[PDB]
Structures are given as C-alpha cells and as structure tokens.
C-alpha cells in the first residue's frame, strides 16, 4: 500500500488553497472538493493514478470512526470560551437538544413519505441524523470577521457542539440497530445502556480531569512534564472510552477538554498556547484529508447512479431543513424571553441562516456508504450529503454576508469613528515630528526620503425651553458615562481590577448609556455581589456542626486503606489465596482492636465516634471510617467555592467606588449649570454611600474570607510594583539582562505560589491590629508605652460615642464594627482599622464631627494627656509628631492636588505615589525663610498664615501655593505652628 504521495499532495493543496483564497468570502473547502473531483476523474481515466489513490480513497470505516471524529470534536471543545458558554448553559442546551430531536424526527418522516426509495424507519433516522450536525468553526470565524458580537458567537458554537455530540450518539445507536441486526433490544438493558451513556461517561472524564489538574498544580519550573502528562491523560480517557461504550468516549473527551480549558491557574500560559496550536494543527490535517477523500469518492462512484429526480429531491430537502431550522427558533423564542434568557429579532434572523454543515456529516456519510456494501443506499446517502454541504457552504455564506451588510450589525458607532480619527491624527503628527527630527542628524542625511515616507504611512481602516435643558441633561449624562468607562479601563491598565469585574462594570455602563435618561444603578451591583446568600452557606452551616499524638490517626487512616484489600478478596492456587485472606482479616481485626485500646488509653471518655468504633470492633464496612478525612476536604472545597464569589463582589464594589470618586472629581470644570451639578453630585454621593455601607456589612458578616481576599490583593500589588521597578532598572542599563531575567523568574514563582494560597485566614487579635498602625511603625518603646495604657471599650448598636462642640478627649481606633460619621453635608462610614480624631488631638481643636454606631462596636480609647506627654518626651528625628503630621498632611492634601490639576491622565494611584515621594520640611533650620526652586514641583500650606517680602500677601489655609510666589516668610504664632508639604523631583 502506497499512501505517502496522497497525503503530501493533500497538505500541499491545503496550503495553496489557504494562501490563495483569502480575500474571497467563500471558504477554501469548495476548492478542495473540486480538486478532489478532478483527481477522481483523472484516476478513473489513468490506471496508475488509480493505483496510487485506491489505498487511501477506500479505507476501513473503523479508522475513520475511531480517529477522525474524536480529534475533530476535541478540537471543537478546546476552541471554546468556556465562561461565556456557561453563562447561558440552560438556554443553549435546551435549544440544541429540542431542535436536534424535532429536526431529526421531521427529516426522517419527510424522507419516509417523500422520494421513491421505499426506505424503512431506521434508515430515515440515520439519514436525518447525519445531516443535523453543524460546523462550529466556520460560523464563529465569519461572525467574528463581521459584526463583533461575542454572545452570538458563543451561543452558536455551544449549540453546534451540543448538536454534533448528540447527532453522533443517535447515529451510532441507529446504525448498530440497522446494520448488525443480531443484537437484542429488550427494554431493561436498553435503558441501562442509555443511562450509562448519559451519566457514567462525563463523570469519568470529570474525575480524570480533576486528578490531572491536582497533579499539575504541584509542578513548578517545568514546562515539559505537564505537556506529556496532559497528552497521556487525554489518550487514557479516550482508550477507556473506546474499550467501554464507544458512543461515550466522545462525551468523555469533550468533558475533559471543557474542564481543562476552564482551568487557567495551575497551567502556565506557554503550555496552554502550545496545546492550542497542537490540537488546531491536528484538526486542520484531518479536515483537509476528509474533504479530499470524500471528493474523490463522490466523483468516482456516487455520480453514476443518479437521475433527474435525484437532482430534483435535494433542493426540496434543503428548503425543508432551512424551514424547520427557522421554525424551531421562532417557536422557542417567546419561552426564552419569558423565562429570562430571550433573544432579539436580529439575532434570531442571523441564527436562522448561521447553520453550516461541516465535515462530521461527510464522515458519517462515508461510514454508512462503506458499511452499505455494493448497494444503492450508500451512493444515495453520500450524494445527498455532499450536495447539501456544497449548497449551504456557499449559499448561506453569501446570504449571511448580505444580511449582515443589510442590517445594523455591520455598523460602526459614531464614538468609535471619532476615536479612530483622533488616533490616526495623533499617529500622523507623531510620525511627522519624528521624521522632521531624524532629517537633521549628520549620520542619516543620505537616505532616500520618498521611499521612507511612502513605505511607513498609517491609514484609518474605517471609512427655560424644555428642549434646551433636556439637551444639557443628555450631554452631561453621556459625558459622565464616557468618563466612568475610561476610568474603569485606567484601573485595569495598572493591574488593580480583575478582568471579569471590569467586563461586568463596562457592560453595566454600556447598558445604562443605551437607555435614555438612565444613570448607572447600584441595585444591579447589589444583585451581583449578593450571591453569597445561597444554599452553599447552608451546606457550610450543617457541615461545621457535623464536624496522645497525631500520627496514630494518620496510621489508622492508612490502616483503613489496607483493610480495603481484604474487602476485594471477599468480593472474589485458589486455596492458598483463601488461606491468605483469612489471616489478613484476622490481622486487620487485631489492628483495629489495638487501635481502640490505644484510644481508650489516651482518653477514657466515650463519644459518638468512640461508640461507633466500639460497635465496629463488636461487629468483627470500612467506608464509614473514611469520613474523618472526608469532612475537612469538603470544608476546604466549600471555602474556595464561596471565596471566589466574595472576591469578585469585593473587586466590583471597589472598582465602582473609586471610578465614581474620580468621575465626580472630573465634572467640576466641565459645565457651569447649578441645578445639573447639584443633581449629579446628589446622585453620585447617594450611590457612593449605599455601596460603601453594603460592602461594610458584607465584610462584617464573615471576616475570614474578606481577610484572605485583602491579603491576596496587597501581596499582588506589592509584587507587581516590584516587577515594574525591576523592569525600569533593566531598561536603564544598570544591570545585565540575565540577572533581571532571573529576578523576574523569582517574582513569577512567588506569584504562582501565591495563587495557591490557603483560604479563610483567621482574623487577627486586637493587639495585632494595634501593632500595625501606620505611625506606630514597629517602635518598641512606643509600642510598649501605648499598649501600657490603651483602654478598650464596647458600645452597643444605636448609641453615640462622641459629639462635636467638645474638646479633643483623645484619638479612637475602631477594632470591631461599622461607625457612621455625620457632621458639617459630611457623611461617611468608617470600619475596623481606621483611626478617629488625629487632627483633633494634633491641632488641639474642638471636634467637628458626630459619631454614631450602626452595629455592636469595640473601640480603642487613648487619653490625650498621655499622648501629649509621650509626644513632648520623645524628640528623635523620626518622632511620632513628624509621622502623625505627615500622615494627616498627605490625607488632607491628596484631594486638593487632585482637584486643582485633574487633567486627562492623572489618577488616584499616581497622585498618591507623587505625594508619597516627597517629604515634609520644617522652618526651624530655614529661619522662617523659604525660596521656591525648580527641583520641587508642588508646595502646600497645611495650616497657618504665610507672608512674603516683595508682595506681602496673606495666604489662607489649607492651600496649595502656585509658582507665582518666590519667597515665603512666617511670623511667630503661639496659637499655631505653620507647616508646609513640598514634593521634589527624582
């Protein structure tokens, strides 16, 4: 058998038709089919080409059924976006299953009473099933090429996959019924077989996928072991499926592919991209081979047994299948709308014409033709399937192209056009200035400028009247929504916000912008983060109440595993085996009894588990012993299952509140209408307060998960900033490349190890919180002195702690609860770990706020006189006074520098770093004389009065002072010591 030339020519023709058929809208598979037809007619004429093509044109059905199908289905599974697929699992699954069933039955009942073949009922079901299969890849490809709607692509791909799997299953059972009639089909074993293929396959695939993921989670700095392990696991599942029920192996591999593709943490990205490329290449090879094979086979023998009526019938069949495909979706759209997963007019219209028949139908046609022998049914099946495929693959493509061009999907929004125009203009200006600069140097003044300026051009690829006040409302709304949307992207760019939270926030913003006079709401986000109130909490609640050395328990657990072997023996030369078994059982009994004795020795009390162990010993059922180890793993999986959702909710809330703060700061210099400004500020502040209260309560309800999430966020931010500093240091040429590479490798290893951190860290004790105050930066004498006299207080809900119009009794520290701060317009909520009244004790001013308790609160109280003696006792350079005033100054100075220079490109994190780099300066060594230089950028006066010499102008406080002034002097005031905050350059 000679086969090499056929495969090499197939690869060559596939590459040629991929390269030279790209601008055309129709796919290259039609060219492949006609090339196969030419090869078939040539081989029918010339005998040598017939000898060279017979070895592959007519090959066994078993190799086709066992290699060409599972690879295609597994690639279709691997090319999925799993999350958007599971977002609409129920809708797509019910639609695919019911539509497949009704389409197959209708096509079978059409083929039975139409035509003149006098076909039976099983042949009708086989014919109906082999053309209900659709193609996932092509539809998603040309939907992504024009229209840009990911929901439609994901639902159509999921429908195609769920159609292909069920079509394969039903075709297989009906072929087994029709071609090998020796089998028996009693109801009991048949329903057992259906239950087996329904439930047993996917469970096995899921189990092996979980085991493989768990094994891969422990591999560090090894990109070659995991690839081999993954391939071996995939083949092992396929082999178990093959030796098992054949119709279930495809289900097992698609389940494993979905599970493996869903997981993205324990697998490094390089392994993922390599696996994607590998399976894509294998599927491409299979597709090319099957198309050429079916072209040759349909041309050689299928087209010499047809008539005029056989050409007449396929048009009717195509019309019928299109009509039923449209009718199913038309009938099922209202139910989907009523339940809450409805579609629209345009999506239904495009999904009616989005059904392309792929290569799986060709494979099943080849199988039925090869099994049919030298009969006519194989020729009819192959001819009809090839005709339907070659019709739809061009007709539906052209129709869907025209439909997209004639509807609103192939349209570009005006803001997108404006953004593209601005980007193109900026690129053109940058290129022009770069060229103008580069024309001036004396080393590159000879190059041909026409070629250089013509071979690098960038072109755009896209080409009191109520009405007045309402128009102001509309433009204000649209501009505010634009600002929020750009802020949520700036947050993601620095790596602070998660991808899913960003997607949800931008989707909500777009939904709010689309609807007229509709602001962004908080109830939808409340639903987004309220998912914790779900039955998993009830599993946790029941499971926690369900509930000498430690090595004894581990050894006993192991002992139980040993007992499993005798069990198997019981389940079961023979004499010797039996004898061994009795001895083994006796030994196990002895061990158990000894274990019980040891337990009694360690403890004489009797418990429920002790009573159960005594009953077990009295019996001499080892499965009842493993629950002791089963329970903690169930706890550990429920912990992560709730931790993921809590993390997502916290990220969404924090992103929304920070973006809203920035947007509220940016509106102040846009429009100058008092009423609209008042309304916008009112809405923003109401949303902010409600969101912060809800997040505070959510954190308070269960603290361990919140503590774990906060720790993970802090660690991630610190590591990201360290990586950025390493990259900046490498870019300046201070160190060699490979040292930076190994440092980045260490950082990446740290991040990967963090990704598998334990969840639900227990909350710290109050002393740990008191040891982590910002100004109490590990000063042993200060820590000891403050811990010596720190009083602890407890207040019930509904009481008032302190009130304004009173002297500063002392600073407070919230160590448990949620406190409402209300005063003079000024409303906010403070939580655990937030000091109260620093400026009250520093400036010796009366209180300017009122404190109320919204839950049971525990606070830390320190007297002000003790603080005063501790601060006038210590006079070191890093004194507590400097730390306190620096913290208060940066806290009071961030909003001022933000609102003064809120130009396009300044965020919260950047301003915080900018103010963090600088440091406070005193007037003792400057003799009350300051001169503003160019090294320092911004200078802000916190409190006091300023003066000059050549202008002599009073300066109110707190105020940032611009660069107009030059010399600053200060008088001697007993009631106030003036302070300044200056920030210098690098």
Ligand X SMILES: CCCCCCCC/C=C\CCCCCCCC(=O)O[C@@H](COC(=O)CCCCCCCCCCCCCCC)COP(=O)([O-])OCC[N+](C)(C)C
Partner that binds at residue 654, options ligand X, a copy of itself, none, CB closer than 5 to 8 Å by kind = a copy of itself
* Residue from the set 577, 597, 620, 754 that interacts with a copy of itself by CB under 8 A: 754
Any contact of residue 768 with a copy of itself (CB under 8 A)?
Answer: yes
- Segment 111-114 long-range contacts (CB within 8 Å, at least 24 positions apart): 111/317, 114/313, 114/316
Bridge-partner residues for 791, per DSSP? 861
Cα 124 from Cα 507, distance rounded (Å)? 47
Order of all β-strands in the sheet with 980-984? 919-921, 980-984, 936-941, 959-961
Q: Give me 877's structure tokens.
A: 């350079």
* 839 belongs to an annotated ligand binding site: yes
Q: x-or-dash pattern for a copy of itself, window 639-668, by CB under 8 A?
A: ---------------x--------------
Shortest reach from residue 240's CB to ligand X, in Å? 11
Residue 105 in contact with a copy of itself, rule: CB under 8 A: no
Residues 488 to 517 in contact with a copy of itself, rule: CB under 8 A: 489-490, 493
3-class state of residue 980 by DSSP: strand
Residue closer to ligand X (CB basis): 63 or 558: 63
Please state the closest distance from residue 65 (CB atom) to ligand X, in A.
Answer: 9
Q: State how far the alpha carbon of 734 is from the alpha carbons of 578, 722, 737, 740, in Å.
A: 76, 16, 10, 10
Q: How far is the CB of 249 from ligand X (least distance, A)?
A: 8
Contact of residue 582 among a copy of itself, ligand X, none (CB under 5-8 Å per partner type): none
Which of 197, 124, 189, 211 is CA-nearest to residue 166? 197
Please report whether residue 4 would count as binding a copy of itself according to CB under 8 A. Answer: yes
Stretch that binds a copy of itself, among 382-390, 420-428, 596-604, 786-794 (CB under 8 A): 420-428
> How many residues line the site for a copy of itself (CB under 8 A)?
118
- From the list 102-110, 184-192, 731-739, 791-799, the region that binds a copy of itself by CB under 8 A is 731-739
* Minimal distance, residue 124 CB to a copy of itself, in Å: 40
One of 234, 385, 491, 907 touching ligand X (CB under 6 A): 234
| Residue 962 is a binding residue for a copy of itself (CB under 8 A) | yes
User: What's the first-to-final CA gap in the chain, in angstroms?
Assistant: 76
Chain positions 889 to 948 lying near a copy of itself, rule: CB under 8 A, are 890-891, 904-905, 912-913, 916, 933-934
Q: Which is nearer to a copy of itself, 210 or 602 (CB)?
A: 210
Burial 482-508 (b: 16+ CB within 10 A, else e): ebbbebbebbbeeebbbeebbebbeeb
Nearest to 341 by CA among 534, 158, 509: 158
CA angle 177, 179, 185 (to 5 degrees): 25
Contact between 24 and a copy of itself by CB under 8 A: the answer reads no
**Among 193-201, 298-306, 359-367, 439-447, the segment contacting a copy of itself (CB under 8 A):** 439-447
Residues in 247-266 that interact with ligand X by CB under 6 A = 253
Give the nearest distance from C-beta 282 to ligand X in angstroms.
7
Q: Which does 902 bind (CB under 5 to 8 A by kind): ligand X, a copy of itself, none?
A: none
**Do residues 510 and 478 touch, judged by C-beta distance below 8 A?**
no
User: 234 vs 268, which CB is nearer to ligand X?
Assistant: 234
Annotation-wise, does 838 bind a ligand?
Answer: yes
Contact 74, 234 (CB under 8 A): yes
Decide: residue 428, CB within 10 A, 0-12 exposed, 13-18 middle, 19+ buried: middle
The Cα 782–Cα 778 span in angstroms is 8
Number of alpha carbons in the 13 Å side-chain half-sphere of residue 98: 13
**How do beta strands 857-861 and 791-795 pair?**
antiparallel
Q: Tell me how far, at minimum, the Cβ of 15 lies from a copy of itself, in Å.
A: 5
CB of 159 to ligand X, least distance (A): 22
Do 844 and 808 contact (CB within 8 A), yes or no?
A: yes
Residue 272 CB, nearest approach to ligand X (Å)? 17
Of 602 and 963, which has the nearer Cβ to a copy of itself?
Answer: 963
In whole angstroms, the minimum distance from the beta carbon of 172 to ligand X comes to 17
Q: How far apart are CA 131 and CA 592, in angstroms?
A: 62
3-state SS string for 748-769: HHHHHHHHCCCCCCCCCCHHHH
Q: What is the CA radius of gyration of the chain?
A: 37
| Selected binder of a copy of itself within 141, 198, 232, 554 (CB under 8 A) | 232
Please pick, from the candidates 230, 287, 370, 699, the single residue that binds a copy of itself as defined by CB under 8 A: 699
Tell me which of 192, 236, 590, 620 binds a copy of itself, using CB under 8 A: 236
Report DSSP letters for 526-559, one per residue. HHHHGGGSSTHHHHHHHHHHH---SHHHHHHHHH
State in angstroms the smallest separation of the CB of 295 from ligand X. 22
Does 506 contact ligand X by CB under 6 A?
Answer: no
Q: Looking at beta carbons only, is 236 or 546 nearer to a copy of itself?
A: 236
Of the candidates 145, 222, 475, 799, which one interacts with a copy of itself according to CB under 8 A? Answer: 222
Looking at residues 734 to 753 of the shown chain, list those that interact with a copy of itself (rule: CB under 8 A).
734-736, 739, 742-743, 746-747, 750
Long-range contacts of 431-436 (CB under 8 A, 24+ apart): 431/456, 431/458
Binding partner of residue 234 among ligand X, a copy of itself, none, CB under 5 to 8 Å per kind? Answer: ligand X
User: Using CA atoms, how far apart are residues 353 and 392, in angstroms rounded to an integer?
Assistant: 10
- x/- track of binding to ligand X for residues 41-80 (CB under 6 A): -------------------x-xx--xx--xx--x------
* Per-residue contact flags (x/-) with ligand X for residues 384 to 403, judged by CB under 6 A: --------------------
* Token digits of residue 521: 């709401």
Under rule CB under 6 A, which residues in 192-231 are in contact with ligand X? 231
Rounded CA-CA distance 226/203 in Å is 23
847 is in an annotated binding site: yes
Q: Which of 398, 725, 929, 951 touches a copy of itself (CB under 8 A)? A: 725
3-state SS, one letter per residue, for 180-233 = CCCCCCCHHHHHHHHHHHHHHHHHHHHHHHHHHHHHHCCCCCCCCHHHHHHHHH
Helices of type H across 800-930: 838-842, 864-873, 880-900, 908-917
DSSP, residue by residue, 485-507: HHHHHHHHHTT-S-HHHHHHHHH
Identify which of residues 355 and 664 has a Cβ nearer to a copy of itself in the complex.
664
Taking the complex as a whole, the smallest distance from the CB of residue 284 to ligand X amounts, in Å, to 14
Question: Judged by CB under 6 A, does residue 597 bind ligand X?
Answer: no
What SS3 state is found at 920?
strand
Among 60, 448, 796, 925, binds a copy of itself (CB under 8 A): 448
Q: Which of 13, 238, 353, 970 binds ligand X (CB under 6 A)?
A: 238
d(CA 61, CA 225): 35
Q: How far is the CB of 281 from ligand X (least distance, A)?
A: 11
Closest CB 296 distance from ligand X, rounded Å = 20
Does 837 show up as a binding residue in the annotation?
A: yes
Report the partner that residue 315 touches, choosing among ligand X, a copy of itself, none (CB closer than 5 to 8 A by kind). Answer: none
List residues near ligand X by CB under 6 A.
60, 62-63, 66-67, 70-71, 74, 231, 234-235, 238, 253
Per the annotation, binding residues for 3',5'-cyclic AMP are 837, 839-840, 847-848
Binding-site residues for 3',5'-cyclic GMP, in ranges, read 837-839, 847-848
């Amino acid at each position: 058998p000679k086969v090499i030339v056929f495969i090499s020519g197939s690869c060559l023709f596939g590459a040629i038709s991929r390269s030279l058929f790209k601008k055309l809208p129709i796919p290259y598979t039609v060219v492949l089919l006609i090339l196969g037809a030419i090869l078939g007619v040539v081989a029918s004429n010339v005998p040598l080409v017939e000898e060279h093509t017979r070895d592959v044109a007519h090959m066994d059905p078993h190799v086709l059924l066992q290699i060409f199908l599972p690879v295609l289905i597994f690639e279709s599974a691997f090319a999925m976006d799993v999350h958007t697929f599971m977002r609409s699992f129920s809708q797509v699954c019910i639609l695919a299953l019911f539509g497949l069933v009704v389409a197959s039955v209708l096509t079978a009942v059409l083929a039975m009473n139409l035509f003149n073949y006098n076909w039976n009922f099983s042949e009708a079901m086989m014919f109906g099933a082999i053309m209900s299969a659709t193609d996932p890849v092509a539809v998603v490809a040309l939907l992504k090429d024009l229209g840009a709607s990911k929901q439609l692509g994901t639902i159509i791909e999921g429908e195609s996959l769920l159609n292909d799997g069920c079509a394969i299953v039903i075709f297989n059972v009906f072929m087994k019924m029709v071609f090998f009639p020796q089998l028996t089909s009693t109801v009991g074993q048949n329903v057992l077989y259906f239950l087996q293929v329904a439930v047993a396959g996917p469970l096995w695939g899921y189990a092996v996928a979980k085991v493989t993921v768990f094994f891969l989670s422990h591999i560090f700095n090894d990109a070659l072991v995991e690839i081999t392990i993954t391939l071996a696991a995939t083949y092992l599942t396929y082999y178990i499926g093959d030796i098992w029920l054949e119709v279930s192996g495809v289900l097992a591999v698609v389940v494993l592919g979905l599970i493996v593709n869903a997981e993205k943490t324990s697998i490094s990205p390089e392994v993922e991209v390599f696996l994607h490329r590998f399976w894509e290449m294998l599927a491409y090879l299979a597709n090319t081979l099957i198309f050429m094979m079916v072209g040759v086979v349909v041309t050689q023998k299928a087209l010499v047994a047809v008539d005029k009526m056989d050409w007449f019938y396929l048009i009717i069949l195509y019309l019928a299948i299109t009509i039923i495909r449209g009718m199913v979706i038309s009938l099922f759209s209202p139910i989907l709308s009523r339940i809450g997963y409805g579609l629209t007019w345009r999506n239904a219209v495009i999904m009616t014409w989005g059904g392309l028949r792929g290569a799986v139908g060709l494979a099943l046609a080849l199988v039925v033709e090869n099994l049919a022998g030298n009969d006519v049914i194989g020729s009819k099946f192959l001819f009809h399937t090839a005709g339907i495929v070659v019709l739809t693959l061009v007709i539906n493509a052209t129709t869907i192209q025209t439909l997209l061009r004639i509807l609103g999907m192939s349209d570009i929004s005006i803001p997108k056009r404006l953004a593209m125009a601005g980007a193109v203009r900026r690129i053109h200006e940058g290129q022009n200035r770069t060229l103008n600069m580069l024309k001036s140097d004396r080393f590159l003044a000879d190059a041909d400028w026409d070629i250089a300026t013509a071979a690098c051009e960038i072109s755009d690829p896209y080409s009191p009247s109520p009405r007045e006040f309402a128009d102001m409302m509309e433009e204000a709304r649209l501009r505010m929504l634009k600002a929020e949307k750009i802020s949520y992207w700036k947050q993601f760019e620095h790596g602070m916000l998660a991808r899913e939270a960003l997607r949800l926030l931008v989707q909500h913003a777009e939904v709010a912008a689309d609807e007229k006079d509709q602001f962004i709401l908080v109830d939808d986000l409340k639903k987004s983060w309220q998912i914790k109130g779900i039955y998993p909490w009830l599993k946790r609640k029941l499971e926690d109440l369900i509930s000498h050395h430690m090595a004894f328990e581990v050894t006993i657990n192991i002992a139980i595993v040993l007992n499993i072997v005798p069990i198997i023996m019981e389940f079961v030369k023979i004499e010797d085996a039996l004898r061994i078994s009795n001895y083994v059982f006796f030994v196990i009994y002895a061990i158990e009894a000894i274990v019980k004795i040891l337990g009694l020795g360690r403890h004489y009390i009797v418990s429920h588990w002790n009573k159960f162990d005594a009953f077990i010993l009295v019996v001499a059922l080892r499965m009842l012993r493993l629950t002791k180890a089963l329970i903690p793993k169930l706890i550990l999986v429920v912990n992560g299952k709730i931790n993921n959702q809590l993390s997502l909710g916290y990220d969404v809330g924090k992103g929304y509140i920070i973006g809203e703060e920035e947007v509220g700061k940016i509106i102040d210099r846009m429009v100058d209408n008092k009423k609209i400004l008042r309304e916008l500020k009112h809405i923003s502040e109401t949303g902010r307060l409600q969101v912060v209260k809800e997040l505070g309560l959510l954190q308070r309800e269960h603290p361990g998960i919140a503590v774990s999430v906060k720790t993970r966020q802090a660690i991630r931010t610190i590591l990201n900033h360290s990586r950025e500093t390493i990259h900046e240091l490498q870019g300046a040429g201070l160190l060699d490349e490979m040292e930076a590479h190994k440092l980045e490798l260490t950082v990446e290893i740290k991040m990967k190890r963090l990704m598998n951190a334990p969840s639900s860290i227990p909350p710290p004790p109050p002393e740990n919180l008191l040891k982590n105050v910002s100004w109490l930066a590990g000063d042993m004498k200060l820590i000891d002195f403050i811990k010596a006299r720190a009083s602890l207080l407890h207040f019930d809900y509904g009481e008032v702690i302190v009130r304004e119009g009173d002297e500063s009794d002392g600073l407070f520290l919230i160590v448990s609860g949620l406190v409402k701060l209300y005063g003079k317009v000024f409303e906010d909520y403070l939580t655990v770990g937030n000091v109260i009244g620093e400026m009250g004790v520093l400036t010796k001013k009366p209180r300017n706020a009122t404190v109320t308790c919204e839950t049971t609160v525990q606070v830390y109280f320190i007297t002000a006189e003790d603080m005063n003696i501790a601060i006038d006792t210590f006079t070191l350079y890093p004194s507590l006074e400097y730390r306190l005033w620096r913290v208060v100054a940066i806290r009071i100075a961030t909003p001022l520098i933000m609102e003064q220079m809120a130009f396009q490109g300044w965020t919260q994190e950047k301003v915080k770093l900018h103010l963090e780099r600088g440091y406070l300066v005193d007037l003792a060594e400057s003799h009350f004389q300051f001169n503003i230089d160019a090294t320092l950028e911004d200078v802000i006066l916190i409190n006091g009065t300023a003066y000059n010499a050549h202008t002599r102008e009073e300066i109110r406080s707190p105020c940032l002072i611009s660069r107009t002034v030059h010399k600053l002097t200060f008088q001697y005031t007993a009631t106030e010591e003036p302070r300044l905050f200056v920030v210098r350059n690098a």
